[PDB]
Amino acid sequence: TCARCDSXSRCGAXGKXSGXAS
Amino acid sequence: MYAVFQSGGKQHRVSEGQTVRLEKLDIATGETVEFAEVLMIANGEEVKIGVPFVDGGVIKAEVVAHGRGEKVKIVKFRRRKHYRKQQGHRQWFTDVKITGISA
């Protein structure tokens, strides 16, 4: 899997996209 | 006719022919116990106490059974502090059978 999604976390949800691949 | 007596720190109100579960006595299972400390003998015309014992009355009972009651469970629990105890307990009793009230 690999789509990212937060402004800046390691893995949260968020509709943005530079922080986030679980 | 009923009567109030006192055996194991507790008091009992009893009639002619009941079975009473008392605390354990050092009496064998065939001897007729005599409670001479009787607090009230009652009827239509009743002998109460003045001074705390009825001087001219006595209760006699046949000792039926020695035994132990239900097993009760003691649980000591201290939350978040790493402590519990489980313990069992059965209490001794003596079932006597009241054979005579002497007013």
Binding site: - | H82, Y83, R84, K85
Partner: protein
């Protein structure tokens, strides 16, 4: 004198601490080591 009738002397065969076996053995939850710090870690403790 048979093989199921021998027995050691009393005080010869003490059991041994098994650490981490519940509330009632006295040595569960960190087992004699206390709480956090260098001594309670695996392989910890300072040198001689």
């Amino acid at each position: 004198m048979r093989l199921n009738t021998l027995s050691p002397a009393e005080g010869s065969k003490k059991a041994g601490k098994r650490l981490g076996r519940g509330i009632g053995s006295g040595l569960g939850k960190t087992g004699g080591r206390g709480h956090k710090g260098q001594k309670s870690r695996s392989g910890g403790g300072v040198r001689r």
